[PDB]
Every structure is written in C-alpha cells, then in structure tokens.
Design a binder for this molecule. Sequence first.
Ligand SMILES: CO[C@H]1C[C@H](C)Cc2cc(O)cc(c2)NC(=O)/C(C)=C/CC[C@H](C)[C@@H](OC(N)=O)/C(C)=C/[C@H](C)[C@H]1O
Length: 214
Amino acid sequence: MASETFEFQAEITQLMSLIINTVYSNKEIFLRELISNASDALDKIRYKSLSDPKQLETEPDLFIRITPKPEQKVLEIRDSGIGMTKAELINNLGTIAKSGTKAFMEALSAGADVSMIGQFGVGFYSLFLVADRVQVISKSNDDEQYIWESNAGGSFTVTLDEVNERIGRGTILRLFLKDDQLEYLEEKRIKEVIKRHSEFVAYPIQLVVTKEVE
Ligand SMILES: CO[C@H]1C[C@H](C)Cc2cc(O)cc(c2)NC(=O)/C(C)=C/CC[C@H](C)[C@@H](OC(N)=O)/C(C)=C/[C@H](C)[C@H]1O
C-alpha cells in the first residue's frame, strides 16, 4: 500500500520537540494518558450503541489491553472503542493544531507539571516521553483499517492497513520504546503504574504477559 505523507502543523512539531527534549521526569504519566484516551474511545462506542446497538457487533467486548513485545522493544495499548477513519486520523493527529496545543506549551514553559497535559487535550503526545516512533492502527465501523505513523520528525504518514492483525473495531497505539525506557515492557512496572495512576477506569484493563514454560 502507498502511504500518503502529511506535514504536522508547526505548533505540533514544537510540542513534540518540547516533550522529546524538555521533560525529564515523571515519564510514566504517558500510560495514564493513553489509558484515559482509550477509555474515552470506549465511552463513545458504548454511547453510540445505546441507540445503534449493531455498532457493537464488529467487536462485542469492551476492553483496554496492554501488550509488551520485548523482542521488538514495543509496547501496545489497544482499545475496542469507536476507532478513527482515515479522515479522522489526518485531521486530529497532526494537520490541525487543536485548541490547547499552544496553551499547554505556554503552561509547561511557565512550570506546569507535564501531568497536566490531559487537561489541555493534547495528552496523546505524552507518548513521546518514552517512545521515538509510534504507529496508531485504527478501525472505525465507518472505514477500512488504517495506520498513522510518526517518527517524532515533522511529517507523518497514513497508509491503508494490509499488514497488521484485524482489529474488529478500535485502536492500537504501537509505541517503539527508547532504549532507556524499556522498564515499560516489564509486567511488575506496568501493574504498578496502572494501579497508582489509573484507579478509576470503567472498562477492564487486560495485561498480556509472555512467559517461557519451564
Ligand atoms: C477523532 O476524535 C477523537 C477525539 C479528539 C482527537 C479530541 C481528543 C479526545 C481525547 O479523549 C483526548 C485527546 C483529544 N487527546 C489528544 O491528545 C489527541 C489529539 C488524541 C488523538 C485521539 C486518540 C489517538 C484516540 O485514542 C483512541 N484510543 O482512540 C481518541 C481519544 C479518539 C476519540 C475517540 C475521538 O473522538
């Protein structure tokens, strides 16, 4: 499949550099942000299903699932929420600077906790705390499955997905972790972060653990 390439709005590039280069601790907050996002997407499909219950048939179980892939230095955060169409990915993940982008950068620079990023509506970008590359793989009931991809540089690509597992419906955040952030592949560390910062989640959070049979 041929990829389409898009330039990030300048303010989003600025934001990504600020997060990549300027913040030094409490990097674990990325997980609470991505779980909150996943929870929002699940709320949206649950709400939609109230008056359109057939919307659930593409994936009847509502869940958040976290999968460390230590060989690839990858952490995946999956939800069976509403998902995003190709146009939604292009419009919401880089071409248009959302309300809050500039406000957050100003707040961070004046000394706000990076943990406040979610209150500005740009917490997705907190993944660049631990990752230097990301794929967002998404399946809306209203479109085909698509892959958005960024390498923390100034452009991103969107490509029709003929390479990943079918998700019935929903989204996978595939984070390619930095070498100094591989603690986030460890079962105990993930459980710790979830229990400490994501205590009030309405959906089950599943952790996929790969272990050698002795
Ligand atoms: C297309 O509109 C989306 C919301 C919109 C981008 C505004 C929004 C809503 C949030 O809960 C959090 C937001 C931003 N924070 C963000 O930083 C952004 C820009 C997220 C992109 C969307 C997720 C990849 C995406 O995460 C996911 N797991 O699907 C997400 C939260 C999608 C929403 C369901 C969808 O309604």
